[PDB]
Structure formats: C-alpha cells, structure tokens
Design a binder for these strands. Structure first.
Length: 92
DNA sequence: TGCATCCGTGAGTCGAGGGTAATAAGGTATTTGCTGGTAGAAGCTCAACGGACAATTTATAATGGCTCA
C-alpha cells in the first residue's frame, strides 16, 4: 500500500494560519500569494474529510474537526529544519 | 561335321525368428597420443552513476461569493 503522505506545502501554511489569525497575512511570511492557501486545503482534505476552520467576521477561530490534525503538523517542520542544520553544520 | 562343355534361366505379396567360430607367445625398448588440470583470454552481466523530456504540482493572476457593528 503506497503511503500517500500530505503535501509538502499545505502543512506550513496551516501552522501560520492560526498564528497570524488572517489568511492574507499568512501568505506574506511564506512569500506566496493568498490564493495558494485555498488551493492546498482541498487536496489535504481528501485524507481528512474534516473542515479546517470556521468562518468568523474579521477573525479566525478553531474548530474541533481540524484541531485534531493541528497537533500532528507543527513537529514535522521543526525537526526537518533541524535536520537541514545538522548536515550543514557538520559539513562546515 | 559331331563331340562333350559351359552358361544363364526357372513368379510373387506376405510372417518369425535371427544369429556362430577349428585356433595362434612372449620378452625388450622406444615411440606416440590422449586427457584432465591448471593457468591465460575473453566474453559476458548485474550494479551503480551522468544527461534530455514530459505527466503532474504549485503558485501566480483575477473573480465572485459570505461575514457584523
């Protein structure tokens, strides 16, 4: 069974969506456009089947459907960036 | 002109078992000839690496809606 992992892009914008509280401001930190955020939520939804946020006026709140899947994203990028540091540091 | 004398001929499809034997010497030395064995060519063959192209992703461009005070 081929292990269909989540896309390499939807995960990082998902962490900055909660911190920045705004989707437009979530794109300036990742030097991308705001339209790229909505492109990747659907592809990752194929595995989840749960909606990631609940709409609020001029605000972004947390829903339990996507909340379970927040807790298994923020540690992936932490260690891989650490991983980049280790080879780079030992190379020097 | 008569005499032995020699030389081919004398059917054919079919079946079954189907092949045997009187006998003969030992040396020497030299020479030839093959046969596996073991090393060289040589001849692949699987396993890693370098250099163009296209199905698939992504992000970039708008576009048109869903929301409170």
């Amino acid at each position: 069974m081929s292990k269909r992992l989540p896309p390499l892009n939807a995960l990082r914008v998902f962490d900055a969506a909660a911190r920045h509280l705004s989707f437009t401001r979530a794109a300036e930190e990742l030097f991308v456009t705001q339209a790229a955020v909505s492109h990747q939520i659907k592809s990752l939804e194929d595995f989840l089947g749960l909606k990631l946020f609940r709409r609020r006026n001029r605000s972004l709140l947390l829903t339990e459907e996507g909340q379970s899947y927040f807790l298994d994203i923020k540690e992936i990028f932490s260690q891989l960036t650490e991983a980049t540091r280790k080879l780079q540091a030992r190379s020097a």
